[PDB]
Amino acid sequence: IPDGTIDPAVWGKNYPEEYQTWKDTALPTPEGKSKYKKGNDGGKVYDKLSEYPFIALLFNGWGFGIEYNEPRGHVYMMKDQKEIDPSRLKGGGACLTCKTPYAPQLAQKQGVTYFSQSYADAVNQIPKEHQEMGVACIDCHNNKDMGLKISRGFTLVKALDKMGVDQTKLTNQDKRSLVCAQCHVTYTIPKDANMKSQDVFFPWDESKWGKISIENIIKKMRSDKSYGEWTQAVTGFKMAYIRHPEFEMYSNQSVHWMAGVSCADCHMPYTKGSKKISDHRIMSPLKNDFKGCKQCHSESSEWLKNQVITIQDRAASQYIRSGYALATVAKLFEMTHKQQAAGKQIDQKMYDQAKFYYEEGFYRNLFFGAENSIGFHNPTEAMRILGDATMYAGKADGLLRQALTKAGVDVPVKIDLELSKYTNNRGAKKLMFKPEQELKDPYG
Amino acid sequence: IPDGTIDPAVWGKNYPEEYQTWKDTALPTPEGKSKYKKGNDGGKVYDKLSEYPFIALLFNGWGFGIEYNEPRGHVYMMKDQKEIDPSRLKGGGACLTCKTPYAPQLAQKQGVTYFSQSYADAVNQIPKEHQEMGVACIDCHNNKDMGLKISRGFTLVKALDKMGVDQTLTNQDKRSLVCAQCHVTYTIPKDANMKSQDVFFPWDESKWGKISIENIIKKMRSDKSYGEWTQAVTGFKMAYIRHPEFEMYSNQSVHWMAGVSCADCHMPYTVGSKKISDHRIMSPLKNDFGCKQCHSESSEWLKNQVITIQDRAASQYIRSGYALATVAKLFEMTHKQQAAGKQIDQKMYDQAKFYYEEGFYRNLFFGAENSIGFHNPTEAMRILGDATMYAGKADGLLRQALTKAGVDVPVKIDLELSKYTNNRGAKKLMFKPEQELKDPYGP
Ligand code: HEC
Ligand code: HEC
Ligand code: HEC
Ligand code: HEC
Ligand code: HEC
Ligand code: HEC
Ligand code: HEC
Ligand code: HEC
Ligand code: HEC
Ligand code: HEC
């Protein structure tokens, strides 16, 4: 209750159950319960570059092409960021924004330096005792009455203002998703001429409540060259990026959203006399016997598990197929640039159109692959996005094949992706392909 | 109800309510309630070739490229086949199979002639007074107890046997199977003179609840007999897919795995301990939603959900349909270049043709299904996604081979759709631009 209290022990003194289950995200999750989200099952780390090998080629040229693991329980958020391969920490102090309760005051005390400083200096702004402290009670609760509060004013509230949302019209069921939307959103780190971070914002420009489309997000990402954060190595393109857009995906006219279901309904199941205790061991619903689903569905865990995986398998199929396709188009751009050096002249108009389409498909495939539900959050929308990804890839592929053939180059029907070179010997730790972790096309 | 009685008036003499709603499918449906299925709304005929202009090109070289309308009420079943453009009636006597209660007896009495005869001779097998009689009570009920019975043995039960299904099937199964007597895809194998030999459901190597588009395509490819028409733009001899509602709905869809039957949504019920079932079978968007019987959301919420899904599925269908039309036009360009002596890589041509078929049959499977994705949303999208993929593979291959042969391929292929949508058939059917169902996510 007292002002200035970050210490979760003070908050949990009168809330022992919530305090205990909150701590319990430290526990390893049960193995063999989820098909696609196995992070920290039996303590294992899951390498997304080994589950989805094409991203090892597509994300090559910055941190995401070196180390990129499945997510774990909340308590590890700072620790896992501490041990991630240093390539990912090139984003600097901006990377504290959704990880430590110190982020708001540090942003407000350092100004632009908060984002632009090195990650190490950023962590050293935090007291040593608190430098591994993950999301705490104060991050989603106000200390006067408890009850949901958006701590992340400088990101989520600013984005909501961009959308024209009236904060005085936000219900508690809204906040039962908005407290997660403080971090389970896609973001942009604008960079200056030295490629140093200037801000963190959610690219919700020109979007409305319940309608943050991938089309709108892409249009914002394209709108400014400060929004180019990395260079794709295989293509040499300076590109923007999309990260874990759970809130944008789920709230975009999905079935459960339109039914009024909040993140917490599925991820914070409750136990009830008149006194309510919500489970704060936030995890995959597949891994706590669907206890949240069963508060509105009277079906067995077996029935619900079947519904989820039936949907995820179709979506994962399209994701993998469009992913190999986009990697093929990247390899085709590599060929194009190697032919340009060898004097072959390429039609500038077909090249420009292919590049535009390739970006459209890439950002679509990335929106899906970055999202942590494998389509279950918004099934048909996810498929729509992947379908367009598939479309745009084809457009780019065909264009490059024509233009290259018009310049006299022989384009093989099968482009070799050489994924072994991208999946292995990654970074300082020389991370290797783990073939047992590959999530193969369920319909291939 | 006496034996040998097809007359539905005799059947409904003691079941007047069901008889009355059964008759009422003659009523025009209300305008402005459905987005995608508007057949006979206010008495209007909706031309699918004007709703989806690309299919006018893709289906060209037989009847589906001349006249192909949205479906309407059951009573008009025979009448609409009578007035359809004769190009579609070239299927012959086989086309009686899902339209007359006389079909089983005509099949058992005529043998192969039942399928091979002309449509006119087939209709002349029926008494003139009954020649416009659509699906009747005997087609779904036995006359001793009114229990649900499968009239179409020579089609549906044979397909069920092919699947290993033991008919000794619950009543909730038959609350979909009486619809699967006709709301399925079929194959009409042809002989050397293009004469119809049979009607069967290509469910080979499929299982109950798992009749995939992949299984269907593999069966259709398995025999030449199954080439029923020649696609004009490409010159390819092709198989076909028709209204696969049962295959689409029952392939591990949300409602299917929840145990919902066709009749749960399409024959809503209302009396003490007994049930009166609505036989004015129509779009649920058009009778204020049947849905209410397991859902506590408003009809507005349900309408919104349905059209939200349909808009996403229709977008993918429209995009892939234009892509497949483009690939077809590219083959046309390829054949005219070959005729001009230009040499085309046979291995790229072969791969492109195989991919074009894979994409075409997938896009057709969706476009022929009458729910626009709602029967099985993610599966519908998966199929469309794969169509999009295969179309893309064919397009690029053709562009490469054509460019390698020295041909200059425009970036945008002119489809010339107006020559395919207008001046169609005996009625000289024209494009109706007010009926076009444009891409909901387009510009
Ligand atoms: C600066 C550029 C950042 C770095 C470095 C990392 N993050 Fe994040 N983060 C956020 C969420 C909601 C999750 C869980 C969902 C998911 O992982 O997809 C994560 C997860 C991580 C992890 C663990 C997973 C991994 O190995 O990638 C690491 C190592 C990590 N993040 C590093 C949320 C946010 C966020 C909120 C808006 C921001 C600004 C960042 N993350 C930025 C960085
Ligand atoms: C009449 C035409 C309708 C419409 C428009 C909808 N339903 Fe159903 N429904 C039932 C069950 C068990 C589920 C699974 C979810 C759950 O267990 O509660 C659903 C699901 C839906 C959805 C969302 C699913 C989807 O992918 O579309 C929607 C939009 C929907 N329904 C609309 C149960 C039943 C029935 C019980 C016998 C009946 C009848 C219907 N539904 C009919 C309809
Ligand atoms: C967001 C990421 C949260 C963090 C961090 C913590 N809690 Fe929480 N809590 C959250 C939600 C969405 C809810 C549901 C609120 C609702 O109105 O539905 C809760 C609930 C509580 C409650 C209310 C009683 C209950 O339903 O369990 C209490 C007393 C509570 N939480 C305490 C609490 C403590 C002590 C925390 C840190 C240890 C803590 N919460 C973290 C979201 C989030
Ligand atoms: C930022 C401060 C966050 C808030 C608020 C919420 N989450 Fe979170 N989540 C965050 C991170 C950085 C991570 C990864 C942690 C790591 O060490 O890898 C996560 C992880 C999850 C998970 C996945 C893995 C697992 O739990 O086994 C889930 C299911 C999850 N988060 C759900 C969730 C919900 C529903 C939230 C709001 C109510 C929420 N989180 C808040 C960052 C942040
Ligand atoms: C039920 C109706 C849900 C709602 C509402 C939300 N999510 Fe969810 N989530 C759900 C499922 C069935 C799954 C799949 C889990 C599996 O094992 O496959 C997920 C997944 C996630 C994850 C990843 C989980 C993990 O173990 O790594 C995260 C981080 C997540 N969901 C977060 C999240 C947020 C922020 C939501 C609201 C904006 C939300 N979920 C809604 C079910 C449901
Ligand atoms: C109430 C708060 C719910 C929770 C928690 C979960 N679901 Fe749900 N679900 C709910 C509604 C109102 C609806 C609309 C249909 C209806 O019954 O009114 C749904 C829908 C589904 C579906 C089908 C929709 C789709 O995803 O395409 C499934 C397959 C489903 N629900 C399962 C499910 C699971 C596995 C959940 C936990 C992970 C879950 N639901 C949470 C209401 C609520
Ligand atoms: C063959 C004998 C059929 C059986 C058995 C069932 N249906 Fe049917 N249906 C059939 C045809 C040939 C047509 C088109 C009729 C025409 O003149 O165009 C239809 C039409 C429908 C419709 C659309 C109704 C509308 O208002 O447009 C629906 C919704 C429909 N059919 C569903 C349906 C159901 C649920 C069935 C089992 C209960 C069923 N049909 C049986 C052919 C045949
Ligand atoms: C059952 C296996 C059928 C066979 C064999 C044939 N048709 Fe049919 N028809 C069937 C259904 C379920 C429906 C309604 C659904 C739909 O997509 O229309 C129809 C509809 C028609 C229509 C009206 C709609 C239209 O296309 O104009 C006509 C004119 C029609 N059918 C004609 C027709 C012909 C010529 C056939 C022989 C090749 C034929 N049908 C076979 C079910 C079945
Ligand atoms: C609800 C859960 C349904 C089940 C089970 C089945 N169908 Fe259905 N069907 C449903 C909807 C919401 C719609 C959309 C109607 C619209 O106007 O958009 C449909 C569509 C059809 C149609 C075409 C309707 C028309 O007016 O032309 C037909 C012929 C049809 N569905 C048949 C059908 C069959 C044969 C089913 C079982 C195998 C079946 N439907 C299941 C809702 C639901
Ligand atoms: C299939 C396409 C049918 C046709 C043609 C007719 N009926 Fe029907 N009927 C059908 C179904 C799927 C059902 C539901 C059966 C169940 O077990 O739930 C029915 C139901 C009846 C009943 C039972 C009472 C009721 O639920 O309404 C009766 C008495 C009945 N039907 C009579 C009837 C008559 C007289 C018909 C011709 C005019 C007729 N039905 C056509 C499917 C089909």
Structural domains of chain B ordered from first start: 8-416 (1.10.1130.10)
- Structure tokens of A367? 């929106």
Which one of the ligands is nearest to B138 CA?
Answer: 10
Name the β-bridge partners of A271. Answer: A277
d(CA A149, CA A132): 23
- Partner A, chain B 201-220, Cβ-Cβ below 8 Å: 214
Put simply, whether A9 touches B (Cβ < 8 Å) is no
Residue A277 host element (H or E): strand A277-278
Sign of CA dihedral B321, B322, B326, B328: positive
Using CB atoms, pick whichever of B252, B382, B441 lies closest to residue A383: B382
Q: Give φ, ψ of B434 to 5 degrees.
A: -65, -10
Cα of B295 from ligand 2 centre, angstroms:
7
d(CA A24, CA A73): 8
Per the CB < 8 A criterion, the answer to whether B435 and B47 are in contact is yes
SS3 of residue A231 by DSSP: strand
Residue A380 host element (H or E): helix A379-406
d(CA A332, CA A441): 23
Q: Give φ, ψ of A291 to 5 degrees.
A: -60, -30
Q: Which of B215, B297, B403, B409 to mutate to test the interface with A (most CBs of A within 10 A)?
A: B403
Q: Does residue A156's CB lie within 6 angstroms of at least one atom of ligand 5?
A: no
Report CB contact under 8 Å: B397, A381. no
Put simply, whether A87 touches B (Cβ < 8 Å) is no
What distance in Å separates residue B105's CA from the closest CA in chain A?
42
Q: How many CB pairs under 8 A join A and B?
A: 115
- Partner A, chain B 257-286, Cβ-Cβ below 8 Å: 257
Of the candidates A338, A360, A352, the one whose C-alpha atom is nearest the C-alpha of residue A400 is: A352
Report CB contact under 8 Å: B308, A379. no
d(CA B85, CA B425): 7
Per the CB < 8 A criterion, the answer to whether B276 and B18 are in contact is yes
SS3 of residue B373 by DSSP: coil
What DSSP letter does each residue of B146-211 carry, written as one string?
--B----IIIIIHHHHHTT------HHHHHHHHHHTTSS--B--B-TT--B---B---TT-BTTB-
Chain breaks in chain B (C to N over 2.5 A) after: 168, 270, 289
Using CB atoms, pick whichever of A253, A310, A315 lies closest to residue B252: A310
Which residue among B371, B374, B379, B437 has the greatest number of ligand 9 atoms within 8 angstroms of its CB, and so is best to mutate? B371
Per the CB < 8 A criterion, the answer to whether A276 and A302 are in contact is no
Per the CB < 8 A criterion, the answer to whether B200 and B152 are in contact is no
Q: Beta strand A238-239 with A277-278: parallel, antiparallel or unpaired? A: unpaired
What distance in Å separates residue B319's CA from the closest CA in chain A?
8
d(CA B105, CA B107): 5
Sign of CA dihedral B156, B160, B162, B168: negative
Q: Does residue B156's CB lie within 6 angstroms of at least one atom of ligand 9?
A: no
Angle between helical axes of A379-406 and A301-341 (0-180°, round to 10): 20
Put simply, whether B78 touches A (Cβ < 8 Å) is no
Binding region of A: 34, 69, 72, 74, 88, 95, 98-99, 137, 140-141, 172, 176, 180, 183-184, 244, 256, 263, 266-267, 276, 278, 280, 284, 293, 296-297, 312, 372, 377
Sign of CA dihedral A369, A374, A380, A381: negative
Put simply, whether A379 touches B (Cβ < 8 Å) is yes
Residues 6 or more apart in contact with residue A246 via CB below 8 angstroms: A180, A184, A185, A263, A371, A372, A373, A377
- Partner B, chain A 391-420, Cβ-Cβ below 8 Å: 391, 393-395, 397-399, 401-402, 405-406, 411, 413
Q: CA-based angle A88:A89:A95, to the nearest 5?
A: 110
Q: CA-based angle A336:A337:A340, to the nearest 5?
A: 90
Question: DSSP code of B30?
Answer: P
Q: Does residue B152's CB lie within 6 angstroms of at least one atom of ligand 7?
A: no
Of the candidates A54, A87, A38, the one whose C-alpha atom is nearest the C-alpha of residue A369 is: A54
Of the candidates A41, A137, A281, A373, the one whose C-alpha atom is nearest the C-alpha of residue A292 is: A281
Of the candidates B386, B385, B260, the one whose C-alpha atom is nearest the C-alpha of residue B312 is: B385
Query: Resolution reached, in Å?
Result: 2.5
Q: Give φ, ψ of A296 to 5 degrees.
A: -130, -10
Amino acid at B279: H
Report CB contact under 8 Å: A405, B409. no
Angle between helical axes of B213-221 and B346-368 (0-180°, round to 10): 130
Of the candidates A76, A154, A81, the one whose C-alpha atom is nearest the C-alpha of residue A123 is: A81
Q: Does residue B7's CB lie within 6 angstroms of at least one atom of ligand 9?
A: no
d(CA B285, CA B29): 10
Residues 6 or more apart in contact with residue A1 via CB below 8 angstroms: A10, A11, A143, A144
Q: CA-based angle B94:B98:B100, to the nearest 5?
A: 95
Name the β-bridge partners of B44. Answer: none
What DSSP letter does each residue of A5-39 carry, written as one string?
---HHHHTTS-HHHHHHHHGGGSPBPTTS-SS--T
Q: Which of ligand 7's atoms lies nearest the C-alpha of B70? A: 18
SS3 of residue B230 by DSSP: strand
Q: Which of B411, B412, B413, B441 to mutate to test the interface with A (most CBs of A within 10 A)?
A: B411
Which one of the ligands is nearest to A74 CA?
Answer: 4
d(CA B327, CA B58): 10
Of the candidates A443, A322, A331, A312, the one whose C-alpha atom is nearest the C-alpha of residue A391 is: A322
Q: B203-226 burial, b for 16+ CB within 10 Å, e for fewer?
A: bbebeeeebbbebbbebbeeeeeb
In chain B the first and final C-alpha atoms are separated, in Å, by 59
Q: CA-based angle B187:B191:B195, to the nearest 5?
A: 75
Report CB contact under 8 Å: B381, A384. yes
Q: Beta strand A230-231 with A238-239: parallel, antiparallel or unpaired? A: antiparallel
- Structure tokens of A274? 């008149």
d(CA A57, CA A70): 18
Neighboring chain B residues of A317 at a CB cutoff of 8 Å: 382, 385
SS3 of residue A201 by DSSP: strand
Amino acid at B182: C
- Structure tokens of B202? 């290509």
d(CA B286, CA A186): 40
Amino acid at A72: R
Amino acid at A281: R
Of the candidates B244, B228, B288, the one whose C-alpha atom is nearest the C-alpha of residue B380 is: B244
SS3 of residue B274 by DSSP: coil
Binding region of B for heme c: 34, 69, 72, 74, 88, 95, 98-99, 137, 140-141, 171, 175, 179, 182-183, 243, 255, 262, 265-266, 275, 277, 279, 283, 291, 294-295, 310, 370, 375
Residue A335 host element (H or E): helix A301-341
Of the candidates A25, A34, A33, A56, the one whose C-alpha atom is nearest the C-alpha of residue A369 is: A56
Per the CB < 8 A criterion, the answer to whether B429 and B69 are in contact is no
Binding region of A for heme c: 34, 69, 72, 74, 88, 95, 98-99, 137, 140-141, 172, 176, 180, 183-184, 244, 256, 263, 266-267, 276, 278, 280, 284, 293, 296-297, 312, 372, 377
Q: Does residue B280's CB lie within 6 angstroms of at least one atom of ligand 7?
A: no
Residues with CB under 6 A from ligand 4: A 29, 39-40, 71-74, 76-77, 80, 98-99, 135, 139, 179-180, 182-184, 263-264, 267, 282-284
Q: Give φ, ψ of B200 to 5 degrees.
A: -145, 160
Put simply, whether B174 touches A (Cβ < 8 Å) is no
Residues 6 or more apart in contact with residue B54 via CB below 8 angstroms: B318, B321, B322, B324, B325, B415, B417
What DSSP letter does each residue of B91-135 carry, written as one string?
GGGGGGTTT-TTHHHHHHHHTHHHHHS-HHHHHHTS-GGGTT--S
Half-sphere exposure of residue B216, counting CA atoms within 13 Å on the CB side? Answer: 28
Name the β-bridge partners of A238. Answer: A231
Per the CB < 8 A criterion, the answer to whether B384 and B439 are in contact is no
Whole-number Cα distances in Å, A357 to A58, A121, A240, A389, B342: 15, 40, 15, 9, 31
Q: Please give the distance of CA B48 from its chain centroid, rounded to a whole number.
A: 12
Of the candidates A89, A49, A62, A418, the one whose C-alpha atom is nearest the C-alpha of residue A232 is: A62
Name the β-bridge partners of B424. Answer: B429
Q: Does residue A23's CB lie within 6 angstroms of at least one atom of ligand 3?
A: no
